[PDB]
Every structure is written in C-alpha cells, then in structure tokens.
Ligand binder design. Structure first.
Ligand SMILES: C[N+](C)(C)CCP(=O)(O)O
Ligand SMILES: O=C(O)CCC(=O)C(=O)O
Ligand SMILES: [Fe+2]
Ligand SMILES: [Fe+2]
Lengths: 372, 378
C-alpha cells in the first residue's frame, strides 16, 4: 500500500507525471528518467540486464504522451517514439527520487554502525562460513556494517588467508606477492593505528591478517573505527573536519625494496553529496602536504593533530588476541589497525594480504537473494 | 630560482618567509617544516618512512631561529631545540605557498588531454620488454596521455597477462583473470556480442574501479570491429568550459551503476560521473550506458538539468572529432587508464571472426615500475 499505485496525472507539458499510491503518498517522475529506466526487453536485455540504448538514442524532446495506473502497475507511452512500457508499483516506489535527499556533511551511510571499545569483535567459525550460507552471510554482513570481523577455528596452514579471501572475492596482488609474511622475534634487546597503503590509488579496500604461530605474550591486535574518530571531530570541530575533508594530503612509500608509490587523497573522503566514504591515516607514509593553501595550513595541522588524538584514544580501540588458525579482516577504507605492546618474549608468525570490497558486497548480495 | 637569498621569521614564530635569488618569495609554517624534517630521527635513512606521529610534535612548535647558508635553510624549533637543514631545491619543489589554482575541473599538471587530431601513440612489444628506455617511454605515455598502443606482439592466447606483468599486477574479478572478448551465446555482457559499444569506462559498478584495462587482438578479420578511444578528461573539459552549471551537476551528484549479468554476481556502486578531488582537480570519469542504474540521489528539481548535462557529455563523447580510431591487427593491443580514457568498438559481422582478450591491472604498479625506471635511467 506504501508501494501500491492508485492513480496518475501527467503534466500538460508531458515533462513529468505524478504517481499517487494507496496510502495517499505522491511521487513525481520525469519523462526522460522514466524513458531511460524502461525495463522492457528493447531497453534492458532480458538475458543480462544491460541497457540497450544510449542517452543520445533517446529523443531530446521525449515526453509522456499518456499514462495510466492499473492492477498495481503504471503504463506510460512516450512521444515522439510512441513507445509503451509498464512499471511495477514496487519498482517505482523503491526507485523514487522525488524525496528529501539527506545533505548533512560528514554523515555516515545508514548501512554502517560506528563503534568504540564497547563493541565486541564479531567472531565466526571457519568451517561454518564455508558450509552454512547463513553463517557466511552474517560474517560478510558484519564486515559491511562494522568494518571488521574475526574468523576462528581455521587451519594452521601457509596461504590459508588466500582461501579466506576466495570465499568472497579476489586478492589484490602487489610486488610483495599475493600475500606477505609478518615474522616477529621478541626478546630482551628488544626485537600508531593506521590504514594500510594510503599511497596506493585505488587503496586496497580489505586487509586480512592470519596467525600461524604465536608464542609471545601481549601484542593484542587493535582496531579503531576511522568513521567514529571522524564523527567525534565533526561534532566537536566542524571547521576542522571540513579542513581534513576539503584538502588532499599526500602519501608516499619510497623504499630501498624497489617500490615507489605515491597518492594524492584527503584523510577524510566524502562523496560529492557529503557522505563519509573513506579514511586514510598513516603516520609512516605521510608525505609533504603541498596542496593545502598557506592561509589554511595552520588550522589544517590543528585538525590533523586532533584526529590523531581521537585515533590514539584507548577508549576507541577494540582489542583481541590471534591464536594459530585465527584471522581478522578489516575494511581498510574505514577501520584502522595496530597492535598493543609485547609484554613477554617469544615468536610470532602472521600472514597478510589485501582483497577488494566490491567482491565482498557482490557475494553478500548474492547470499541475501538466495536466503531471502 | 631555487637558491635562497634571505629569510624573515614572523613575530609569533609560526612561519618564516624565504626569498629566493630570482626575487620570488615562499612562506613555510613552523609546524609544516618540523613535520617534514629530513634528518635520521624524523625520516628513516633506509626507506625514507616517517618516524614520528603528529602527536609527537609539540603543539606550540615554533621557529626560534632561521638562517640561509650554502643554498639551504637551517631552522631551529622550540620547544624541542631541534635544528634541521632543508636544501633550497627541496623547499622549492615542496612549497605550498604557490597560489595554487582553484579552477574547478582542472586536470593534474602530470596529464595532457587530447582529441582525434593526435594519432595514437604506439610502442613495440619486443622493444619495451628488452629496452628499459622504451619501457619507460611506453609506461610514461600511459601515465601522461592515459592511452598507448603496443604493436608487433605475439599472436598467442594469454599474451595480455605477460603484458600486465611487464609493469604491474592483474586485478582478477568475477570476469576472470582475463576475459574472452568475442560473441557468446547467452552473453553475460554486451561486450560479448557483435554489437557496437558506445565509448565507456569499464566497471563503473565496481568500487574500487579497475584503474587500467588491456585489450589484446588475436583475430579481427570480420568487417567492422574498429577500436575507438576518447579522452574523458577532454570531454569533461569541454563541458566545464561550455556549461559550468552542467559540469557542476555531473561532478556534484552521485550516479548509480549496477551489473547483474548472471546468477552469482551483483556489483553496485554509487559514484559521480565526474569525480573531483576536494580542491577541484579532476580524478576520474565513470561513463557506461549499459550499466548505469536508476539515478535516485539527484533532487527532483535538478533531475532535468542533470539529464541535459549527461546528454551533453554523451554528445562530446560521441563526437567523431574526439575519438581516436584504429583497427587492431593480430598481436596488437592497447592499454587505457580506465579512470580517464574511454574505449569503444564498432559492431562487426559477415565473413571472418573476431577475438580479443581483456584484463584489468592497476596504475599504482605502473607508476612504481615507471618511477624505478626513471631512477635507474637518470
Ligand atoms: C569484462 N567486460 C565484459 C568486458 C566488462 C564490460 P563493462 O560491463 O565494464 O562495460
Ligand atoms: O570489443 C572491443 O573492442 C572492446 C570490448 C570492450 O569494451 C571490453 O571488453 O571491455
Ligand atoms: Fe599495517
Ligand atoms: Fe569495455
């Protein structure tokens, strides 16, 4: 009834129509938008959903000739083509644009929930996510909503992290390989939270860390929600937030290992309509900020410092241990990671790799369709 | 020019003003200079990585003294009592008090736009893999121009992967490590048909978008099947200059993209057709008629004007004077910066067969390979 069309009027111009639903709500649709979004077999390929026409193919003077609501659907005929198409009621309501578009600068998407140290680490079973699609769905949904999740009871096997990535997507291969070794000896001698690779564009969007061996005390993994840090800055200091979102920083890795990577991106990235979409924060690979005008540099640095203070706040960190066979994924466009200090001697062997979020969301979409 | 003549410090100690030998002035803040110190306690000698956090620098950091000497600036910071030296060349190269352009929709200084008046740049398969100069020049052409042909290559399946391996790494996707561009029954995508394709960037429904694409010819014996490339930055520039409001609509509102071409895949993205940096520099173009999804993020009162701007951009992209056209022969390929340069093909039919192979790679690898080659060759 929210989605059941009742009636329609076409404007005298034919430039738009106004659809009334059974609950009394109205939604206006332009002729050009309706024509471009026609769902019939000659606009959208039945076999693959690809649109068969370009914007150039649609006559510039396209108008609604006539329209009618009947049996839960809208019939519309366009001029000058003479093309008649029908739209289900549910589709029109779901794809409506005649609505109040939220414009709040720095807002998070409704699909994510921000967190601090009160958030327990989401934890899922390695075997369950492979054999139970509901478990797999919930695992990937946790990564989508919260930006991280643990996988426990996995195999103590080299390269197992690559198998984890392959459950939903594909590894971003780099000059270090499809995965890399993180070996640590801790002894008396003795042998900040960040996002990885802000000097890569596009940034690798997921990171996996997988434990094979751990005999050292302490050194718990920590995750910090970049969106929560940014939210706190926005609420306290909107001008400071605007500075970090409104000017690009520079990142560079120029090692002796034959990799020289640079990127020009802001530390807080917004969509053009103000939604917070990414965080880049890494002290080790920050490079000279050449793009910020002189008049803003002092205040930019003050805001940068303040963001760092929120990131350094121990009340923001979620900490956990990785036993052999355990791993975690972070959304590397949002959630920062680090570890706590070691409190005892021993050895550690982790493996690390990157994967991409587009594959994760596709797999999640496919699972939601299969389960719903 | 990069030789410092003299320096003054502000009363607060918050910045200094450096005057060079050509009369030019550049101001540098105390905090920015301290944060960019090049000494072994701020930057690693081994890899150049920064050894401090922003929190480690005292909040009241200020210039206690500054002097010019031997073509360099020596500065002491309070309260650390830390003295560092910056070469004049470094200060000039990394200056931010430069009156940076705020022209909305300007391109990066490192790119050069083009239309049909420039013939396609071409490089040789054997030369780029055997001569480091040729490799550098090839990769640098892709970096600057967003497009290059690689000719005289082998007529061998999977040769495009060897091409990718010359500079970087394959972005493997749902479509495969590489994909077969040929007519398929029950096609999952109109790329796999005999139909002509409007100029487009691949996978605007994928976030992150693949940043490079390789297209490699094995057979092209049918009538038609010509390749065309269009510089999306040139198209965007033309819209910017002709119609500022239209340009602003396409840069300032997200579009939607969606691919659901078979069971087992559902890719969606929410990104503008013209992506700008927050300071107005052009970053990326996303344009693909086949996978543009319903635009739900544009206010009702702006939708008609948005569509008019979209139409106009399409007219620039379809303009034959913007397209660089060629027909690939067996063993020839090209690479596009898939964030910038659009590609197209004319439909094909009749006697003959067409078989291209395609894959994605990433620019970060290309830039690293190029950067390393530039260090080694000069
Ligand atoms: C891999 N592919 C079928 C060539 C993609 C074409 P797009 O859907 O990106 O236009
Ligand atoms: O067939 C061609 O020349 C190009 C097809 C294409 O656009 C693609 O494979 O992405
Ligand atoms: Fe890391
Ligand atoms: Fe394509």
């Amino acid at each position: 009834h929210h989605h059941m069309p009742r009636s329609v009027t076409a404007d005298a111009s034919g430039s738009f129509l106004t659809l009334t639903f059974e609950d009394g709500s109205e939604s206006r649709f332009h002729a050009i938008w309706l024509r471009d979004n026609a769902l019939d077999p000659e606009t959208r390929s039945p076999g693959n959903g690809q649109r068969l026409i370009t914007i150039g193919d649609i006559p510039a003077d396209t108008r609604i000739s006539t329209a009618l609501v009947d049996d839960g659907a809208l019939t519309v005929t366009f001029a000058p083509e003479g093309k008649t198409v029908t739209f289900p009621g549910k589709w029109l309501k779901s794809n409506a644009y005649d609505t109040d578009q939220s414009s709040e600068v720095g807002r998070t998407s409704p699909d994510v929930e921000t967190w601090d140290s009160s958030q327990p680490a989401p934890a899922f079973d390695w075997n369950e996510v492979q054999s139970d699609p509901k478990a797999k769905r919930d695992w990937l949904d946790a990564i989508a909503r919260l930006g991280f999740a643990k996988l426990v009871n996995g195999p103590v096997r080299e390269g197992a992290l690559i198998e984890c990535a392959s459950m939903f997507g594909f590894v971003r291969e780099t000059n270090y390989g499809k995965y890399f070794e993180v070996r640590t000896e801790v002894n008396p001698t003795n042998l900040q939270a960040h996002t990885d690779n802000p000097y890569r564009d596009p940034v690798p969007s997921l990171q996996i860390l997988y434990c094979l061996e751990n005999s050292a005390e302490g050194g718990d993994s920590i995750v910090v929600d970049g969106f929560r840090a940014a939210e706190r800055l926005r609420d306290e200091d909107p001008e400071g937030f605007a500075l970090l979102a409104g000017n690009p920083a520079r990142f560079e890795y120029k090692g002796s290992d034959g990799v020289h990577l640079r990127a020009r991106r802001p530390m807080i990235e917004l969509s053009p309509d103000g939604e917070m979409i990414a965080i880049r924060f890494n002290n080790r690979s920050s490079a000279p900020f050449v793009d910020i005008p002189f008049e803003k540099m002092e205040a930019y640095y003050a805001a940068y410092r303040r963001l760092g203070e929120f990131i350094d706040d121990p009340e923001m960190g979620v900490s956990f241990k990785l036993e052999p066979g355990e791993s975690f994924i972070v959304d590397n466009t949002r959630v920062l990671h680090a570890r706590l200090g070691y409190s005892g001697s021993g050895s550690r062997w982790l493996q690390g790799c990157y994967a991409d979020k587009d594959g994760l969301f596709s797999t999640l979409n496919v699972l939601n369709a299969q389960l719903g």
